[PDB]
């Protein structure tokens, strides 16, 4: 069995595009793979964070992952800062990465934009991410092309350590098993839907209430043709809505096209709004149950204990290879 | 009860200059102050360390501090890597420090000077040093003048953190016991990391080594035993070592060796060093052969961990990490 590690940024609340692209399939994948889901609060403070908002977003994210079907007895769900091994191994990895390798990172050259003076944490983001992955002998990281450079560095650091001290790390690969449709912004169908869009009409989050879902689908961009047909280059907006509808309803695009022959966009959108609301309502109900239950803290307590068991053993092996500490 | 924190670098040695300059006094101050003595193995690996030699030198330094007289029922002696809070707090402080502050550190520029392949840890270790200090609400840090820039940054990071989040850190101060110079280049301080082993006498040098290093200590060719830092830095430094170890003033040593040569003066000084180190080395071997050494280090980590994990809990609460409520 292969191991999967997903780091989850707390600040952002899940969009349907994330759910459809890379999260929903994990409800079943968690039984075929050994899955780690890690809320990276330590990565979150590499930029400016309001403390109360960060704490609430950490909890909300855990409750959301449980609400969608992540099973804490099949997968390991935990908060990064509650496993000290991540900080310990990130320091050891800082000691084998070259400064030049960090300065070259594209994400660091961005994010450094209209800031002038930036935190050292933004430069050492990648070693901590490599540590997150490598501590669990991860085989697969479910990320897209925007994280390619970070995965390359992770693979470089694993190989450098293995060749300097002896084989210890698995060399991870970037891959989203059973990847879903790539869902685009409702406002700009050529841009991917993302939780950081400055236009809130661009995304629907898993926590949007019905009125908001209705208004956002209502304003979603289409075209002037009035024909429900998949054509990504000439009808990117309609094509995107067909991808959301198809995956959330279980009907193929061809069947939706046949279904809507002769119909305009008004009735197709009102049907899509209902499909989304019906998808999120159960998730939102279980979510509210988790957020008001003591079982959420107990679940996260054991997630961190089970993660620490694996990661603290890897730290012991790294320290032993590098000369740290004693063996007594 | 003021708190003292001292880092002990296992990549280097413990020289007679450190013993003279600070370490000898700790045997006294450990009853006045709350003293933490930290073997900073995570700082050592910013450059390649031979693993077996690093592991062994960690034990050697712990045994050596005990042999010199550090009292584990009075002070805390522990290994940095055995307290995870140092790495955790270093990360949080890395998020507070600016890259520009780390890059203009003089120690970074010197240590990276001729080096191909510079690790990020060589740039980003001042935050881990700040963490070593701030975690224990340290009042006093006993460091050379070479470290003054690192103490300034630590003071800046503590204030920056205190202003944003609330008064959590003590603002520490550098202590900075004569200043012993290198035996090979007496215009430089004797240094725990000098790459020339003849530059220093370590606390573990045996009699024959001590005699050799003193014999070849560099000196002028004029030949009068007299203190003159500008013209005669070599013999002046040897006079200062001799004075502080024997209890005699430099003037009394000058009168004592009037009309005598360097050979006889060097042989007397070598004996003075040997007689200083011999009891230290005898207790060193008993500690190295003792099960008790590992028990002292276990307790030290327990006590260090209690204070540091508590401070990390407070830092996490301030910044919003975790669930600390
Ligand atoms: C969440 C971030 C990161 C934290 N450590 C890990 C481990 C695996 C995947 C990722 C991450 S994905 C990456 C990102 O910026 O998207
Ligand atoms: C040992 C080094 C360092 C590690 N963290 C600390 C904490 C206190 C004092 C020092 C240190 S002194 C410094 C040096 O290089 O001299």
Q: Which long-range contacts (CB under 8 A, 24 or more apart) does B217-224 make?
A: B217/B183, B217/B184, B217/B266, B218/B183, B218/B184, B218/B185, B218/B186, B219/B262, B223/B261, B223/B262
In ligand 1, the atom with minimum distance to the C-alpha of A8 is 1
How many helices and strands in chain A, by DSSP H and E? 14, 5
Instruction: Identify any residues that bridge with B130 across adjacent strands, giving them in sequence order.
Output: none
Distance CA B246, CA B198 (A): 22
Q: B23-36 as b/e, with b when 16 or more CB fall inside 10 Å?
A: bbebeebbeebbbb
Q: Quick one: closest CA in A to B82, which residue? A: A325
Q: Which of residues 93-112 of A touch B (CB under 8 A)?
A: 94-100, 102
Question: To which residue do tokens 């003279």 refer?
Answer: B20
In degrees, rounded to 5, the angle at the alpha carbon of residue B240 between the alpha carbons of residues B235 and B243 is 120
The tokens describing A187, both together, are 């406002």
DSSP string, A223-253: -SS------TTT-HHHHHHHHHHHHHH---H
Distance CA A35, CA A1 (A): 10
In degrees, rounded to 5, the angle at the alpha carbon of residue B132 between the alpha carbons of residues B130 and B135 is 95
Cα→Cα distances A78→A301, A305, A308, B305, Å: 8, 9, 10, 23
Residue A45 near residue B320 (C-beta atoms within 8 A): yes
In testing the pocket of ligand 2, which one of B3, B5, B6, B7 has its CB within 8 Å of the most ligand atoms? B7
- Any CB–CB contact under 8 A between B318 and chain A? yes
Q: B213-252 as b/e, with b when 16 or more CB fall inside 10 Å?
A: bbeebbbeeeeebbbeeeebbbbbbbbbbbbbbeebebee
The tokens describing A207, both together, are 């926590």
Residue A13 near residue A64 (C-beta atoms within 8 A): yes
| Phi-psi domain of A158 (left: phi exceeds 0; alpha: psi -120 through 50; beta: other) | alpha
Residues on chain B touching A91 (C-beta within 8 angstroms): 42, 87, 90-91, 121, 128
Side-chain half-sphere exposure of B292, counting CA atoms within 13 A: 14
In a 3-state reduction of DSSP, which class is residue B100?
Answer: helix
Distance CA A154, CA A138 (A): 11
Distance CA B260, CA A134 (A): 67
The tokens describing A301, both together, are 């307590």
Residue A225 near residue A243 (C-beta atoms within 8 A): no
DSSP string, A265-325: HHHHHHHHHHHHHHHHHHHHHHHHHHHT-THHHHHHHHHHHHHHHHHHHHHHHHHHHHT-S
CA terminus-to-terminus distance, chain B: 30
What was the structure determination method?
X-ray
Residues making up chain B, counted from first to last: 325
Residues A144/A34/A154/A109 CA torsion (nearest 10 deg): 40
Distance CA B3, CA A322 (A): 31
Distance CA B211, CA B217 (A): 10
Distance CA A193, CA A183 (A): 6
Distance CA A285, CA A279 (A): 11
Strands B3-8, A34-39: pairing kind:
unpaired
Determine which helix (DSSP H) or strand (DSSP E) holds B135, and give its type and residue range. none
Q: Which one of the listed residues A192, A201, A235, A306 is annotated catalytic?
A: A192
- Any CB–CB contact under 8 A between B168 and chain A? no
* Number of CB atoms found within 10 A of residue B4's CB: 22
Instruction: Identify any residues that bridge with A4 across adjacent strands, giving them in sequence order.
Output: A35, A140
Distance CA A205, CA A255 (A): 27
Please answer yes or no on whether B323 and A117 come within 8 Å at the CB atom.
no
* Number of CB atoms found within 10 A of residue A163's CB: 9
Nearest Cα residue to B142 out of B38, B49, B297, B283 = B38
Q: A286-309 as b/e, with b when 16 or more CB fall inside 10 Å?
A: ebeebbeeeebeebbeebbebbbe
Distance CA B226, CA B247 (A): 17
Residues B137/B142/B146/B150 CA torsion (nearest 10 deg): 0
Q: Quick one: closest CA in B to A301, which residue? A: B323
Nearest Cα residue to A292 out of A66, A12, A75 = A66
DSSP B34: E
Nearest Cα residue to A71 out of A242, A286, A239, A250 = A286
Ligand nearest to the CA of A36: 1
Interface test with B, best of A99, A109, A312, A327 (most B CBs within 10 A): A99
The overall longest dimension of chain B from CA atoms, in Å, is: 75
The tokens describing A191, both together, are 């841009």
Distance CA A76, CA A309 (A): 11
DSSP B270: H
Distance CA A131, CA B301 (A): 24
Instruction: Identify any residues that bridge with B3 across adjacent strands, giving them in sequence order.
Output: B34
Ligand nearest to the CA of A173: 1
Instruction: Identify any residues that bridge with A141 across adjacent strands, giving them in sequence order.
Output: A174
- CA A216 from centre of chain: 23
* Number of CB atoms found within 10 A of residue B68's CB: 18
Residue A104 near residue A67 (C-beta atoms within 8 A): no
Determine which helix (DSSP H) or strand (DSSP E) holds A40, and give its type and residue range. none
Q: Which of residues 282-301 of B touch A (CB under 8 A)?
A: 294, 297
- Any CB–CB contact under 8 A between A133 and chain B? no
Cα→Cα distances A212→A18, A77, A208, A268, Å: 18, 30, 6, 17
Instruction: Identify any residues that bridge with B78 across adjacent strands, giving them in sequence order.
Output: B38
B111 tagged catalytic: yes
Q: Write out the E strands in chain A.
A: 3-8, 34-39, 76-79, 140-141, 173-174
**Residue with CA nearest ligand 2 atom 5:** B129
Sign of the Cα torsion B237, B242, B247, B250 reads negative
- Any CB–CB contact under 8 A between B123 and chain A? yes
- B97 → closest Cβ in A120, A300, A323: A120
A195 tagged catalytic: yes
The response to whether B190 counts as a known ligand-binding position is yes
Instruction: Tell how far the Cα of A268 is from the centroid of ligand 2, in angstroms.
Output: 68
The tokens describing B101, both together, are 């502050």
Distance CA B186, CA B169 (A): 39
In degrees, rounded to 5, the angle at the alpha carbon of residue B15 between the alpha carbons of residues B10 and B18 is 95
- Strand ordering across the sheet containing A173-174: A76-79, A34-39, A3-8, A140-141, A173-174
Distance CA B173, CA A50 (A): 31
Sign of the Cα torsion B109, B112, B115, B119 reads negative
Distance CA A24, CA A6 (A): 13
Nearest Cα residue to A77 out of A124, A160, A8 = A8
In a 3-state reduction of DSSP, which class is residue A203?
Answer: coil
In a 3-state reduction of DSSP, which class is residue B29?
Answer: helix
Resolution (A): 2.2
Side-chain half-sphere exposure of A304, counting CA atoms within 13 A: 18
Any atom of ligand 2 within 6 Å of the Cβ of B126: no
In sequence order, the 6+-apart residues with CB closer than 8 A to the CB of A254 are none
| A–B CB contacts, 8 A cutoff, strictly below | 158
Question: To which residue do tokens 């092996």 refer?
Answer: A317
Residue A2 near residue A33 (C-beta atoms within 8 A): yes
Residue A271 near residue A302 (C-beta atoms within 8 A): no
Cα→Cα distances B167→A115, A153, B150, Å: 27, 38, 21
**Residue with CA nearest ligand 2 atom 11:** B7
The tokens describing B70, both together, are 């550090």
Q: Quick one: closest CA in B to A319, which residue? A: B81
- In angstroms and rounded to an integer, the radius of gyration of the C-alpha atoms of chain A is 22
Cα→Cα distances A165→A135, A160, B178, Å: 16, 9, 42
Instruction: Tell how far the Cα of B274 is from the centroid of ligand 1, in angstroms.
Output: 58
Ordered alpha helix ranges (H), chain B: 16-18, 24-32, 41-44, 51-68, 85-94, 99-103, 106-111, 120-123, 125-134, 148-165, 207-215, 233-246, 250-256, 262-288, 292-319
Distance CA B39, CA B10 (A): 6
**Residue with CA nearest ligand 1 atom 11:** A7
Give break positions in chain A: residue before each, C–N beyond 2.5 Å. none
The response to whether B101 counts as a known ligand-binding position is no
Q: A60-77 as b/e, with b when 16 or more CB fall inside 10 Å?
A: bbbbbbbbbebebeebbb
| Phi-psi domain of B99 (left: phi exceeds 0; alpha: psi -120 through 50; beta: other) | alpha
Cα→Cα distances B231→B187, B224, B235, B266, Å: 11, 12, 10, 19
Cα→Cα distances A6→A26, A230, B164, Å: 11, 32, 32
Strands A34-39, A3-8: pairing kind:
parallel
Distance CA B241, CA A72 (A): 65
Question: To which residue do tokens 């413990």 refer?
Answer: B14
In a 3-state reduction of DSSP, which class is residue B325?
Answer: coil
The response to whether B17 counts as a known ligand-binding position is yes
Distance CA B130, CA B127 (A): 5
Any atom of ligand 2 within 6 Å of the Cβ of B147: yes
Residue B183 near residue B190 (C-beta atoms within 8 A): yes
Distance CA B309, CA A168 (A): 29
Determine which helix (DSSP H) or strand (DSSP E) holds B7, and give its type and residue range. strand B3-8
The tokens describing B304, both together, are 């260090």
């Amino acid at each position: 069995m292969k191991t999967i590690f997903s780091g989850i940024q707390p600040s952002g609340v899940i969009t349907i595009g994330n759910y459809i692209g890379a999260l929903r399939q994990f409800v079943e994948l968690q039984h075929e793979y050994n899955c780690y889901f890690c809320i990276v609060d330590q990565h979150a403070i590499t930029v400016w964070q309001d403390p109360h908002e960060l704490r609430q977003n950490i909890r909300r994210l855990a409750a959301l992952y449980l609400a969608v079907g992540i099973d804490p007895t099949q997968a390991t769900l935990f908060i990064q800062s509650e496993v000290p091994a991540h900080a310990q191994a990130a320091w050891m990895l800082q000691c084998i990465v070259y400064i030049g390798e960090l300065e070259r990172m594209t994400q660091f050259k961005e994010k450094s934009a209209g800031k002038e003076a930036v935190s050292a944490g933004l430069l050492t983001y990648p070693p901590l991410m490599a540590a997150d992955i490598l501590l669990y002998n991860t085989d697969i990281v479910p990320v897209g092309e925007d994280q390619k450079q970070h995965i390359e560095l992770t693979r470089d650091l694993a190989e450098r350590f293995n060749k300097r001290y002896g084989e210890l790390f698995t060399i991870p690969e970037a891959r989203i098993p059973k990847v879903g449709a790539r869902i685009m912004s409702l406002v700009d169908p050529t841009k991917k839907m993302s939780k950081s869009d400055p236009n809130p009409k661009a995304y629907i989050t898993l926590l949007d209430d019905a009125k908001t879902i209705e208004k956002k689908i209502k304003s979603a961009v289409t075209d002037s043709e009035g024909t429900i047909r998949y054509d990504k280059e000439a009808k990117p907006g309609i094509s995107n809505l067909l991808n959301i509808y198809s995956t959330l309803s279980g009907q193929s695009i061809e069947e939706l096209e046949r279904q809507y022959e002769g119909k305009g966009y008004g009735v197709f959108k009102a049907d899509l709004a209902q499909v989304v609301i019906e998808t999120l309502r159960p998730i939102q109900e279980r979510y509210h149950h988790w957020m008001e239950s003591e079982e959420l803290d107990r679940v996260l307590d054991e997630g961190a204990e089970k993660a620490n068991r694996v990661a603290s053993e890897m730290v012991r092996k790294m320290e032993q290879a590098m000369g740290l500490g004693r063996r007594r």
